[PDB]
Design a protein around this ligand. Structure first.
Ligand SMILES: *[C@@H]1O[C@H](CO)[C@@H](O)[C@H](O)[C@H]1NC(C)=O
Ligand SMILES: *[C@@H]1O[C@H](CO)[C@@H](O)[C@H](O)[C@H]1NC(C)=O
Ligand SMILES: *[C@@H]1O[C@H](CO)[C@@H](O)[C@H](O)[C@H]1NC(C)=O
Lengths: 49, 49
């Protein structure tokens, strides 16, 4: 009906309590429409604590 | 701000991930009581946490 792709469900954690930190970036508009063909994005990350 | 919280229900706000200025704390000498324990009252702008 609504010709668009949008996130619907967040099923990561049931609840949170005694939290410590939270940060939210500015609003954006990413393209969630399915793309067919050879890969066009490669993202590399390194995490260390 | 215009309103504060109650003594028993003191409102706690977590300050972090933001650029901080402590000059206004002592520049405006409109506070009857201003006391820092374990931290220099005047050197608030020369400390990190
Ligand atoms: C389309 O968006 C409207 C507006 O929120 C919503 O009421 C409706 O349920 C949506 N339909 C579908 C199929 O997602
Ligand atoms: C993040 O997405 C979830 C699920 O769509 C939504 O409930 C929540 O309000 C969103 N948060 C922000 C800051 O957009
Ligand atoms: C939150 O967790 C920390 C880490 O164990 C603990 O020191 C603190 O007392 C907890 N706070 C509450 C309100 O449970």
């Amino acid at each position: 009906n609504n010709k668009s792709w949008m996130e619907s469900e967040f099923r990561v954690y049931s609840s949170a309590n005694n939290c410590t930190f939270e940060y939210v970036s500015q609003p954006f508009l990413m393209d969630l429409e399915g793309k067919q063909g050879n890969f066009k994005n490669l993202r590399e990350f390194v995490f260390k604590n | 701000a215009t309103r504060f919280a109650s003594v028993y229900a003191w409102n706690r706000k977590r300050i972090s991930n933001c650029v901080a200025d402590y000059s206004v704390l002592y520049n405006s000498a409109s506070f009857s009581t201003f006391k820092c324990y374990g931290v220099s009252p005047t050197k608030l702008n020369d400390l990190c946490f």
